[PDB]
Amino acid sequence: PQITLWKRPLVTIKIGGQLKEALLDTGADDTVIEEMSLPGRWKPKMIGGIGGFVKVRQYDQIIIEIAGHKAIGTVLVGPTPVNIIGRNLLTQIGATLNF
Amino acid sequence: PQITLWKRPLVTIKIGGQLKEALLDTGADDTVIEEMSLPGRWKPKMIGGIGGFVKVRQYDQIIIEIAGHKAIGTVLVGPTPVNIIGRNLLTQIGATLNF
Numbered sequence: 001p002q003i004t005l006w007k008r009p010l011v012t013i014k015i016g017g018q019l020k021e022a023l024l025d026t027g028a029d030d031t032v033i034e035e036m037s038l039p040g041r042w043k044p045k046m047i048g049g050i051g052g053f054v055k056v057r058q059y060d061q062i063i064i065e066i067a068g069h070k071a072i073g074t075v076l077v078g079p080t081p082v083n084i085i086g087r088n089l090l091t092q093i094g095a096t097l098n099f
Numbered sequence: 100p101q102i103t104l105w106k107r108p109l110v111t112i113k114i115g116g117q118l119k120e121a122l123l124d125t126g127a128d129d130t131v132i133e134e135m136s137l138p139g140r141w142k143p144k145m146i147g148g149i150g151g152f153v154k155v156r157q158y159d160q161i162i163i164e165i166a167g168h169k170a171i172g173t174v175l176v177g178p179t180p181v182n183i184i185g186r187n188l189l190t191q192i193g194a195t196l197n198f
């Protein structure tokens with residue numbers, strides 16, 4: 001698909017058996033999802049943006065289905081106001097910015 | 100151009116005659132620039148990011164060149180980890196996300 005940016009680029013994802021809406025965000029280095037349980041080991045991380053930093057849990061080797069495409073990578077879980085698909089997974093689905 | 104996302108999508112912008120680096124950010128509704136002098140009056144705006152809400156200065160109808168493409172629109176000035184080009188100006192330069 002070709003997604004225009006007149007509105008927020010929101011897509012459905014499936015993660016841990018759950019359907020969520022997420023923003024495709026080229027300015028996010030990594031994917032961060034609202035609080036949920038994920039399998040496996042995690043370690044703490046701080047991520048920062050407008051308004052400062054938030055503490056998240058970093059899970060590796062997580063599979064997400066993004067607008068029907070599967071990708072695997074690191075997912076950060078924490079108190080984000082919006083689910084964000086970041087570059088670490090956008091690359092895997094072949095997403096590019098074009099102008 | 101086509102910009103892939105293996106690295107941060109950093110481009111050169113020109114604003115006030117000065118070259119700056121900025122991040123193309125589909126997850127940002129608005130464009131946010133580090134502190135600098137811009138002409139004209141400003142009005143208050145609250146924007147929310149991952150860490151919370153913050154007050155910034157809104158300048159309307161500012162001329163900015165982004166990776167060689169001319170835009171004229173709203174620029175917010177405030178404490179930002181990086182200059183961010185948001186959807187309000189990505190749409191003016193015709194940017195789309197493709198996968």
Ligand SMILES: CC(C)CN(C[C@@H](O)[C@H](Cc1ccccc1)NC(=O)O[C@H]1CCOC1)S(=O)(=O)c1ccc(N)cc1
Nearest residue numbers: 025027028029030047048049050126127128129148149
């Ligand atoms: C600020 C950029 C450099 C980094 N952020 C991504 C941005 O796309 C961010 C995404 C977002 C949208 C809505 C609410 C909360 C966050 N939009 C954003 O702040 O919009 C503001 C700036 C002007 O318009 C409004 S991030 O969320 O802090 C972040 C940082 C690290 C990772 N791993 C994940 C995300």
